[PDB]
């Protein structure tokens, strides 16, 4: 019935391929210099008026953290050294003066066309134990969740993002506010089976007929002002290997 919210442009269903290159793949910058990060689309952003370029910043262990949404917008809460600029197809994240806690993995990222993510941009300035989380045999299936709170969930498009060792981000479902739409990638399509709950404000991603290379962190998120992904659940980690 009444008009839902959606987690990209393209996935509107009621009536009212992006390839992203970003360069350098890594920065090395000093305290207090200007750090610049690029990124190139294969098609314009440009959509009524708006611009649909997000920027995230990751740091190890952690999910990613909104910094600018609609090309140029500051996230709430993010200091006025980050900034970003651009139109179409050209696009730029400034930081500058650099922090010590701004050393981490850039990513930018188009909702006009599903979602998709440049390859990163790790900043660094001037003993390890790493979770795999659950593991499965291929062809076999897992069920993750979360839950919201804070928040009407139910106004809210969410998703499922991925990230793989490479620490490549891919989209893997979304799922309009009220739950009638959901959307895939062909990578999952058939075998990936996205649901909430409204009532008691979950999300769901059920897997199936998993795959090798289905191995990821993955990430339930909201989808906030002008498409960005604007929080994200902290990670669950999938092993898929024989």
């Known amino acids: 019935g009444k008009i839902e919210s959606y987690a990209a442009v393209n996935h509107i269903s009621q009536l009212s391929d992006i390839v992203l290159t970003q360069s350098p793949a890594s920065l090395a910058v000093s305290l207090g210099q200007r750090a610049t990060i690029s990124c190139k689309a294969s098609?314009?952003?440009?959509?009524?008026?708006?611009?649909?370029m997000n920027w995230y910043q990751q740091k190890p262990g952690q999910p990613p953290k909104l910094l600018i949404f609609?090309?140029?917008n500051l996230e709430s809460g993010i200091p006025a050294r980050f900034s970003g600029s651009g139109s179409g197809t050209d696009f730029t994240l400034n930081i500058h003066p650099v922090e010590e806690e701004d050393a981490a993995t850039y990513y930018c990222?188009?909702?006009?066309?599903?979602?998709?993510f440049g390859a990163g941009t790790k900043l660094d300035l001037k003993m390890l134990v790493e979770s795999g989380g659950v593991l499965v045999k291929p062809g076999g299936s897992l069920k993750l969740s979360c839950s919201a709170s804070?928040?009407?969930?139910?106004?809210?498009?969410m998703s499922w993002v991925r990230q793989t060792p490479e620490k490549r981000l891919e989209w893997v479902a979304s799922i309009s506010s009220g739950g009638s739409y959901t959307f895939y990638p062909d990578s999952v399509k058939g075998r990936f089976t996205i649901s909430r709950n409204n009532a008691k404000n979950f999300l769901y991603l059920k897997m199936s007929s998993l795959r090798s290379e289905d191995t990821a962190m993955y990430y339930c998120?909201?989808?906030?002002?002008?498409?960005?992904?604007?929080?994200w659940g902290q990670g669950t980690s999938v092993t898929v290997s024989s």
């Open positions: 990222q188009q909702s006009r066309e599903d979602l998709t």
């Open positions: 998120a909201r989808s906030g002002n002008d498409y960005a992904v604007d929080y």
């Open positions: 098609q314009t952003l440009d959509y009524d008026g708006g611009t649909y």
């Open positions: 804070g928040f009407t969930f139910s106004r809210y498009a």
């Open positions: 609609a090309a140029s």
